[PDB]
Amino acid sequence: STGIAPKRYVYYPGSEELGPDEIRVIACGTGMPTARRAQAAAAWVVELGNGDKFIVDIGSGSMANIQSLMIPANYLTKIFLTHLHTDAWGDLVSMWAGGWTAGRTDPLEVWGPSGSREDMGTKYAVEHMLKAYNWDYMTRAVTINPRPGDINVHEFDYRALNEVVYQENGVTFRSWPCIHAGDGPVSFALEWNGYKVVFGGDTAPNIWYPEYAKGADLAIHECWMTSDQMMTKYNQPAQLALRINLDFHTSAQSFGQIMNMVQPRHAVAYHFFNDDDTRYDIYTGVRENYAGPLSMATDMMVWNITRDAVTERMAVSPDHAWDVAGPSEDLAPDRNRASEYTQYILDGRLNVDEANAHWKQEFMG
Amino acid sequence: STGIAPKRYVYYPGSEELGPDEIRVIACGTGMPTARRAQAAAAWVVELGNGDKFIVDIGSGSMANIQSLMIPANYLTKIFLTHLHTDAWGDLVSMWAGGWTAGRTDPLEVWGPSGSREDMGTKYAVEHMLKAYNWDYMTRAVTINPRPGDINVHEFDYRALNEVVYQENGVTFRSWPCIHAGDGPVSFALEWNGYKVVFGGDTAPNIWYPEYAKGADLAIHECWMTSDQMMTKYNQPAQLALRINLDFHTSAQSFGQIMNMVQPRHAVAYHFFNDDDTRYDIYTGVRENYAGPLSMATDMMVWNITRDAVTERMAVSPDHAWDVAGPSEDLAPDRNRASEYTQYILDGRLNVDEANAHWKQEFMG
Amino acid sequence: STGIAPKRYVYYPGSEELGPDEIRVIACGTGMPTARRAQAAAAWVVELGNGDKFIVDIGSGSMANIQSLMIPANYLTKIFLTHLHTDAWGDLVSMWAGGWTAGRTDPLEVWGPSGSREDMGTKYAVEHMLKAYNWDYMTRAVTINPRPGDINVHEFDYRALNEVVYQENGVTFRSWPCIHAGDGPVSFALEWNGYKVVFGGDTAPNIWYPEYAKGADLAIHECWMTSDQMMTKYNQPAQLALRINLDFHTSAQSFGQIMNMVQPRHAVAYHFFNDDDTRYDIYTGVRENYAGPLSMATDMMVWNITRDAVTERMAVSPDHAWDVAGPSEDLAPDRNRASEYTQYILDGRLNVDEANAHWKQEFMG
Amino acid sequence: STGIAPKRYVYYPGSEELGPDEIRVIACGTGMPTARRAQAAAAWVVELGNGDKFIVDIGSGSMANIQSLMIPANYLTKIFLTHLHTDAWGDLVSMWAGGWTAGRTDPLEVWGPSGSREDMGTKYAVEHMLKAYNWDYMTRAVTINPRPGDINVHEFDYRALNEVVYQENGVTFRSWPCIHAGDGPVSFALEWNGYKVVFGGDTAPNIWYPEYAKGADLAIHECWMTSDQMMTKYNQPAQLALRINLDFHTSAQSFGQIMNMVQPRHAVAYHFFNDDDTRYDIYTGVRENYAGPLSMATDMMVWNITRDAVTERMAVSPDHAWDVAGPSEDLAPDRNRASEYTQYILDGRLNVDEANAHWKQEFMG
Ligand SMILES: [Zn+2]
Ligand SMILES: [Zn+2]
Ligand SMILES: [Zn+2]
Ligand SMILES: [Zn+2]
């Protein structure tokens, strides 16, 4: 009566203790290159039982969903990018900037593939994102000590076949290639404490995923909208709309083929618009070849991985979100940085003393 | 009975004809550097009765709201940036890539301010952004004509006092400085067909906005959360919370003084968390010194400016947004372009012919 | 550019003219006798191209949706009830009082079935409803003309096999029995201009629906949650979950059998929780036997029925709904209506003339 | 990191153990006679540290919000009605029928006022409500035990001044007249453990509320839209728009004056449409005379009453709500009780054996 309701049928972010032998995966974006309030672009939050937390992809729009988990910014410092599509990493800037004012005190750590040359790789990309936002950076840095505005980039060969790219505190990430637009993109396997979660990213059907994702607890893979849907919605000629499901993208039928090969405890289809008139065709495509546990992902779906089961719930999270304070500590600023104001601009100040008099007076007692 | 409901109490994007002597302004972001599903970072869509349209600021998260307006990518090629904060242009990338895969045939045109030196200006910011996303650009330009993957930058002097920065088809944008983090930030005024709309951007109270926003049909200005609210939501020390409303940002009372001076037909307050326990005190603050027509901005608020009236209303728009096709032509992909695939990645294609045979044959008829 | 978007991918209620050979059906509730913000209890609004409009069912909570369609109360006076579940006609009371404050000028017309005896029928039910709300009726009628507060009831015989219960202006409703908890429940067929819409109400699988619903433009039918689901969600013993889907309700597999028999242009399944982890099994259940066009119903779904197609879309409507005014002229109150105030209560009034002095001067010019 | 985020900024229903010296109050409706997904008609949940729970009003729409709180049906048995408006008790039926099917064990208890004669009181109201829903009552009593279908009514004298109408377990409700549409409406005071909560219900300014609601921890009173907002929305003439805020309802200005008198810890305004262009004018009305803590209510607003603070939050709760089981027992049917089917109806059962055998088999194994 006055007690707490156990095993809730929805995930309320911040309301639940994580078990030492438990993973929590939250889809903070499941969408497309088209922006949509119901679906941010691809983003995954992993919370391990040992207190380690990772983001895999941080697409355009995902930061709103990520900020809604009531997780302090200092705990969301490690970011893996499958690839360098705006719809895979475009909110990294919002996580760099917003997280910093939210009181991150550590640099961002970013693991992402190379390309076929320096300027098609993750290091080039991050380096120039930081030059793009130089004004934000210098103006911020005069006051706030600049350490957390660092991004340490760990680039790995996109070509490598299931090679470790991260080994720390009992946690392994391995990568392997995808086939998606051009050379560069990868899939991630996260291994910890008996478990294995697989982040496909984006790819046409490839020989590497079905091999290295085998027997995962949670397998995530591109599952595209049908050729019929492509023709109804984007008004594509049948030949173009066919090509999209065979050459550019993993079809639902293809997705089911791969998860039949993988044999996960739980499969996840993402990277399609989950509407009242698309999802059923795509579910049917999958079920042609795969009959095991299947999630049809949308924004703020959550997976609990225990020894017993893989549980799918929806997260009920605050739309009117706020930064939530962490156990970190005020770092000691930098009184050796050059101010970015001229006196021509500071001579613009408006005398507002008389309008602010009444509230300024009550406020100081 | 069978008839369209005229002068509807909410705005349905795509449902109304825009009159030739009418302007329509929609707030696609009203929020803060903290992400929130309820409020994107700053973005304004402006629609003139002569068919000209404009985005003023395109902050982190605004793209979902902009795509909810059912406006073809080709009609939204022109972007004005008040300043180079993540939360004022972080989504220029989503508009670039998105509008390109959605059928934008023309390059993006971008106006923003210079800084005190090259690497503090818009020219440098956008140049290094295109480099940041070079993997996206080069891959996409293989399959899709590259001309609309261009961004033509129009850098204007941030120091200029109320000087034109755009003039085209009887439309003028003027700029004047803001006082905000460091040199470069501006406010804009759009002058067309007897009308004046002011976009304040981000600023502590300054002597220029009161002078140059005078007699505006719609006046927009930063209006910050109360010091008491700074000390409650974030747990600041009194001093730091006082300084924020007296030095770093415009207080409600300040906003009130400025709009008192400006005597706009209609004034808009934005850039605070519009919540059921914040908005009222901020409202009371404005009303200390300003008694005129006022909107307290939140996401998808819209203003109709006619000779007779300045109407405020809410837009009711699809969360499940799709791109909408515009009048323009198919453009031809440049075939003198090297693949970004090596044979090593392409040798990974999976045989999926069988799994896909069922739907495949049915679709070719 | 300044024009309307044609054939929009979502329905904006109030924004689209109905053709003279066109029907529009909006699901205003698709849920259970359990309350849910995301699904109201059963309710349908039918709009014919000839100007006539009808509600079939008005279950608990449906009114907030019906009010969102921006339809004047004076156009929504004709209500047919499939049966007498709270979850089938619970919001009749809200349509009765709400419509009347908001300027309905004609009486409500209700068609509902008889039962096995007097006190199991719509006549008894509505006579005693009006008694329950006698305080509301008498207090409202001092001030507003009592005529719109009349309910004319049209009790049809629940036993009749596919017999006319309404025939006016080229429109026909037939009824036939359901098997649902107790004698009384019916399904209806609306016939107009060569269109046939079937409102299944609630039923266990019966021999009448497949016969009388055959060749429907749009066929609607109960489609219950699976026996696995009933156990998972509600904590059921194995053999009671089995009984729900074979005796009490129409299983998804049965729904497929019926719609296989009916061969409609479009079948609609409804009266199940449409959730991210219920919908897909239900859909696969139907698909075992029925292959034709299907909608899995949710709240605010809309079908456009033309000669050429049956289109499913989602309605996008104001959560902040208001009454909308219809042309219908003024209606003169009574001065043969006793006040319901005694002077004991009326002597309780508070002097507030001075607290209201400021805005009461300002307002009288 | 693996911890639970404490003293959280949103209330997640089901997630917070209630303190023994604490009251929790949720607005489950705040609306008008007009239906709206944003605002249910008036409803209030009170939870007490002794584990007693209470509903005060249960207006049309409210049940969807009540069910979102994840409270078992069996702990929600006691309803107090301020008055007999459809928008104050229209969803009692929904709590009656819906609780019962979800394992409520005890009858509902209902406390409402009498009127000037039997047919204007709560005993008469509820008696005829049960007759109205006789079919539903009689059919449900065949397959589930009939006792939780009962509604034990406690009618009290509306005219009484501050008299005890409930007295159990250290909890005490008092009532006093309102002036609302006609004789019969009241306000409640809930007194428990040195806390006073006051439920305004609906009234024009009266001499009883200020007297009897003095020293209230939480104090709730009608507060109406402005005359200007009445003229603009409902196309009123000038004089009738004036009569509404002086005679029939309590103005913002009068809400101020009355709350100035009562000097509660925390004042609540409700019964106005809480919209981005209405609420502000209403805030400013109330602050002409009241400067104490003030909530402008909307659906799912919650107050925590502790010794130290009256804390406002917003509840973030599932739209896709479900019943949660309580510790109550599995109560048993009745064979005595006569079936409500005739052989005429059962003779209509369709044979669906072949359709259902495949799922029927796998369920039993
Ligand atoms: Zn991609
Ligand atoms: Zn800024
Ligand atoms: Zn029923
Ligand atoms: Zn009332």
CA dist C100 and C149 (Å) reads 7
Across the beta sheet with B301-305, the strand order is: B151-156, B108-113, B78-80, B53-58, B43-48, B23-29, B301-305, B310-314
CA dist A33 and B323 (Å) reads 10
Closest chain A C-alpha to C275 CA, distance in angstroms: 9
Tokens of B145: 């004509």
Helix axes D122-132, C134-143, angle to 10 degrees: 110
Q: Which of B15, B47, B316 sits opposite C318 (nearest CB)?
A: B316
Tokens of C198: 């079937």
Cα–Cα distances in angstroms (integers) from residue B154 to residues B109, B110, B151, C304, D78, in the given order: 7, 6, 10, 47, 68
Cα–Cα distances in angstroms (integers) from residue C108 to residues A139, B68, B195, C84, D164, in the given order: 67, 38, 49, 17, 41
3-state secondary structure A118-131: HHHCHHHHHHHHHH
Please answer whether residues A285 and A272 qualify as being in contact, where contact means their C-beta atoms are separated by less than 8 angstroms: no
What is the structure's resolution, reported in angstroms to one decimal?
Answer: 2.5
Going by C-alpha positions, the residue among B163, B149, B171 that lies closest to residue B113 is B163
Kindly give, in sequence order, each residue whose CB lies less than 8 Å from that of residue D106, ignoring residues fewer than 6 positions away.
Answer: D74, D77, D147, D148
Please answer whether residues B340 and A181 qualify as being in contact, where contact means their C-beta atoms are separated by less than 8 angstroms: yes
Kindly give, in sequence order, each residue whose CB lies less than 8 Å from that of residue B137, ignoring residues fewer than 6 positions away.
Answer: B130, B146, B149
The residues that bridge with D269 in the sheet, in sequence order, are D221, D296
- CA torsion B248-B254-B255-B261 (nearest 10°) is -130
Residue listed under structure tokens 């104090």 = D219
CA dist A88 and B186 (Å) reads 31
Planar angle of CA D12, D16, D17, nearest 5 degrees: 160
D349 three-state secondary structure: strand
Across the beta sheet with A23-29, the strand order is: A10-11, A310-315, A301-305, A23-29, A43-48, A53-58, A78-80, A108-113, A151-156
Please answer whether residues D99 and D91 qualify as being in contact, where contact means their C-beta atoms are separated by less than 8 angstroms: no
Amino acid identity, residue B302?
Answer: V
Q: How far does Cα D90 stand from its chain's mean position?
A: 10
CA dist A216 and C318 (Å) reads 44
Q: Does domain B23-364 have CATH number 3.60.15.10?
A: yes
Going by C-alpha positions, the residue among A234, A230, A236 that lies closest to residue A251 is A230
Q: Which residues of A touch C279 (CB under 8 A)?
A: 279-280
CA dist A130 and C345 (Å) reads 72
Going by C-alpha positions, the residue among A314, A363, A347 that lies closest to residue A38 is A314
Across the beta sheet with D195-199, the strand order is: D163-168, D171-177, D186-192, D195-199, D218-222, D266-270, D294-296
Ligand nearest to the CA of B179: 2
- CA torsion C303-C306-C311-C317 (nearest 10°) is -40
| CA B107 to ligand 2 centroid distance, Å | 26
Domain C10-361+363-363, what fold? Metallo-beta-lactamase; Chain A (3.60.15)
Q: A312 and C9: CB-CB below 8 Å? A: no
A163 three-state secondary structure: strand
B16-21 long-range Cβ contacts below 8 angstroms, 24+ apart:
B16/C4, B17/C2, B17/C3, B17/C4, B18/B47, B18/B48, B18/B49, B18/C2, B19/B49, B19/B306, B19/C2, B20/B49, B20/B50, B20/C2, B21/B49, B21/B193, B21/B194, B21/B306, B21/B307
C358 three-state secondary structure: helix
CA dist B185 and A136 (Å) reads 11
Please answer whether residues C132 and D132 qualify as being in contact, where contact means their C-beta atoms are separated by less than 8 angstroms: yes
Amino acid identity, residue C48?
Answer: L
Interface with A, mutate which of D2, D46, D171 (most A CBs under 10 A): D2
Q: Does domain A23-363 have CATH number 3.60.15.10?
A: yes
Residue listed under structure tokens 């009992």 = A170
Across the beta sheet with C43-48, the strand order is: C10-11, C310-315, C301-305, C23-29, C43-48, C53-58, C78-80, C108-113, C151-156
Q: Which residues of B touch C14 (CB under 8 A)?
A: 4-5, 8, 12
Q: C5 and B18: CB-CB below 8 Å? A: no
Other Cβ atoms closer than 10 A to B278: 18
| CA D72 to ligand 4 centroid distance, Å | 28
CA dist A257 and A263 (Å) reads 10
Q: C280 and A296: CB-CB below 8 Å? A: yes
Tokens of A31: 């969408």
CB of D287 less than 8 A from some CB of B: yes
Please answer whether residues D277 and B9 qualify as being in contact, where contact means their C-beta atoms are separated by less than 8 angstroms: no
Going by C-alpha positions, the residue among C64, C78, C305, C338 that lies closest to residue D87 is C64
Q: How far does Cα B277 stand from its chain's mean position?
A: 26
Amino acid identity, residue B210?
Answer: P
A351 burial (CB, 10 Å; 0-12 / 13-18 / 19+) is: exposed
CA dist A159 and A116 (Å) reads 9
Q: Which of C8, C51, C53 sits opposite B14 (nearest CB)?
A: C8
CA atoms within 13 A on the CB side of A190: 25
Method: X-ray
D354-357 long-range Cβ contacts below 8 angstroms, 24+ apart:
D354/C257, D355/C251, D355/C253, D355/C254, D355/C256, D355/C257, D355/C288, D355/C289, D356/C245, D356/C246, D356/C251, D356/C253, D356/C254
Other Cβ atoms closer than 10 A to C238: 11
Cα–Cα distances in angstroms (integers) from residue D161 to residues A85, C269, D181, D205, in the given order: 71, 54, 19, 16
Domain D23-361+363-364, what fold? Metallo-beta-lactamase; Chain A (3.60.15)
Residue listed under structure tokens 């309910």 = C151
Please answer whether residues B149 and B162 qualify as being in contact, where contact means their C-beta atoms are separated by less than 8 angstroms: no
CB of D215 less than 8 A from some CB of A: no
Name the residue in chain D with its Cα closest to that of B301.
D276
CA atoms within 13 A on the CB side of A64: 30
Tokens of C25: 């059906």
Tokens of A189: 């396997």
- CA torsion D49-D54-D57-D62 (nearest 10°) is 80
Other Cβ atoms closer than 10 A to B213: 28
Please answer whether residues B259 and B221 qualify as being in contact, where contact means their C-beta atoms are separated by less than 8 angstroms: yes
CA dist C131 and C138 (Å) reads 10
A41 burial (CB, 10 Å; 0-12 / 13-18 / 19+) is: buried
Q: Answer positive or negative: Cα dihedral of D246, D247, D251, D257.
A: positive
CA dist D348 and B250 (Å) reads 74
Please answer whether residues B172 and B192 qualify as being in contact, where contact means their C-beta atoms are separated by less than 8 angstroms: yes
Q: B9 and C322: CB-CB below 8 Å? A: yes
Cα of first residue to Cα of last residue in chain D, in angstroms, is: 43
CA dist C301 and C10 (Å) reads 10
Cα of first residue to Cα of last residue in chain B, in angstroms, is: 42
Other Cβ atoms closer than 10 A to B116: 18
Other Cβ atoms closer than 10 A to D127: 17
Residues 28-67 of C with CB under 8 A from D: 33-38, 40, 60-61, 63-67
Please answer whether residues B77 and B110 qualify as being in contact, where contact means their C-beta atoms are separated by less than 8 angstroms: no
Interface with B, mutate which of D36, D272, D277, D290 (most B CBs under 10 A): D277
Q: Answer positive or negative: Cα dihedral of B220, B226, B230, B233.
A: negative
Kindly give, in sequence order, each residue whose CB lies less than 8 Å from that of residue A229, ignoring residues fewer than 6 positions away.
Answer: A278, A281
DSSP class of residue A149 equals: G
Interface with A, mutate which of B30, B34, B347 (most A CBs under 10 A): B34
Tokens of A108: 């961002």
Please answer whether residues D143 and D331 qualify as being in contact, where contact means their C-beta atoms are separated by less than 8 angstroms: no
Cα–Cα distances in angstroms (integers) from residue D158 to residues C141, D214, D262, in the given order: 21, 20, 22
Please answer whether residues D292 and D259 qualify as being in contact, where contact means their C-beta atoms are separated by less than 8 angstroms: yes
The residues that bridge with C308 in the sheet, in sequence order, are none
Please answer whether residues C114 and C83 qualify as being in contact, where contact means their C-beta atoms are separated by less than 8 angstroms: no
CA dist B198 and B191 (Å) reads 9
Q: Which of B276, B296, B314 sits opposite D280 (nearest CB)?
A: B296
| CA A242 to ligand 1 centroid distance, Å | 19
Going by C-alpha positions, the residue among A221, A317, A225, A272 that lies closest to residue A26 is A317
Please answer whether residues B227 and B278 qualify as being in contact, where contact means their C-beta atoms are separated by less than 8 angstroms: no
The two beta strands, C218-222 and C266-270, are parallel
